[PDB]
């Protein structure tokens, strides 16, 4: 199966209060494993998954130094961007950074990502070739030109193709029994009458990992269309996920409707009636 190592960084400016608030989390697939939060006296990188709490202090000291420096760089960037946009130092602004590498089914590097966002909108995006940038305005074009003059895209590519791949393999080894484990969804259908002639069929998929899943409602016959209410996939809080899909059906006609669940943990899709 494919895998990916991703990091998500957030920096929020605090006008009149000194250093901006920096929070950073790392994920292997849909499993967070590290966190850094600079809201402390001497903030450190800490483990957020059990298979990471066996690592030596050399690793955590190295990650703490890397995270602290990036926090300082973001403090400069927030100031630089509010210069580009001629914004007052009294307003709070957000700078978000996400990057990561993705392996193919063969375990080799396949794709890398890097993107910057300012105040919730796209700002600077590294392109699929990991050699060029895409700017959203004149302000981000100065950022692009600075990076192009310093061969920055070559630096980010080297990290994404080499460092990120090497350490993703290491992480996939330390958490082998969990990260490489597929958790199938547990499924059932519930019945809730709206009126005397209508009812709701809600199809549940509980306790699955990873989060990618497909729920559809089908009706006996062909050409049919169902107006399916579909909730966003939500964390159960224990490392697995939940989702459900509901459809309104006429009373007595429930047996002609069917729920179809697809998931990587299912050798074959499962089928449910009520």
């Amino acid at each position: 199966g494919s895998h990916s190592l991703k990091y998500f960084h957030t920096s929020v400016s605090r006008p009149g209060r000194g250093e901006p608030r920096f929070i950073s989390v790392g994920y292997v697939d849909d499993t967070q494993f590290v966190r850094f939060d600079n809201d402390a006296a001497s903030p450190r990188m800490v483990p957020r998954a059990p298979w990471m709490e066996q690592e030596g202090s050399e690793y955590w000291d190295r990650e703490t130094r890397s995270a602290r420096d990036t926090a300082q760089i973001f403090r400069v960037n927030l100031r630089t961007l509010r210069g580009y946009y001629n914004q007052s130092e009294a307003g709070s602004h957000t700078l978000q950074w996400m990057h990561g590498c993705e392996l193919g089914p063969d375990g080799r590097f396949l794709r890398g990502y890097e993107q910057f966002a300012y105040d919730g909108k796209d700002y600077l995006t590294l392109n699929e070739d990991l050699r060029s940038w895409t700017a959203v305005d004149t302000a981000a074009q100065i950022s692009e030109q600075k990076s192009n003059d310093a061969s920055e895209a070559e630096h980010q590519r080297a990290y994404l193709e080499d460092t990120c791949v090497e350490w993703l393999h290491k992480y996939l080894e330390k958490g082998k029994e969990t990260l490489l484990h597929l958790e199938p969804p547990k499924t059932h259908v519930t019945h809730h009458p709206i009126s005397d002639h209508e009812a709701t069929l809600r199809c549940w998929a509980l306790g699955f990992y990873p989060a990618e899943i497909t729920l559809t409602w089908q009706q006996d016959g062909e050409g049919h269309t169902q107006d399916t209410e579909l909730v966003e996939t939500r964390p159960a809080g224990d490392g697995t996920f939940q989702k459900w899909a509901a459809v309104v059906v006429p009373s007595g006609e429930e047996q002609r409707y069917t729920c179809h669940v697809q998931h990587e943990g299912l050798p074959e899709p499962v089928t449910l009636r009520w």
Partner: peptide, 9 residues
Amino acid sequence: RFPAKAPLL
């Protein structure tokens, strides 16, 4: 592994 630096914008 956290990157050693972040790009200057």
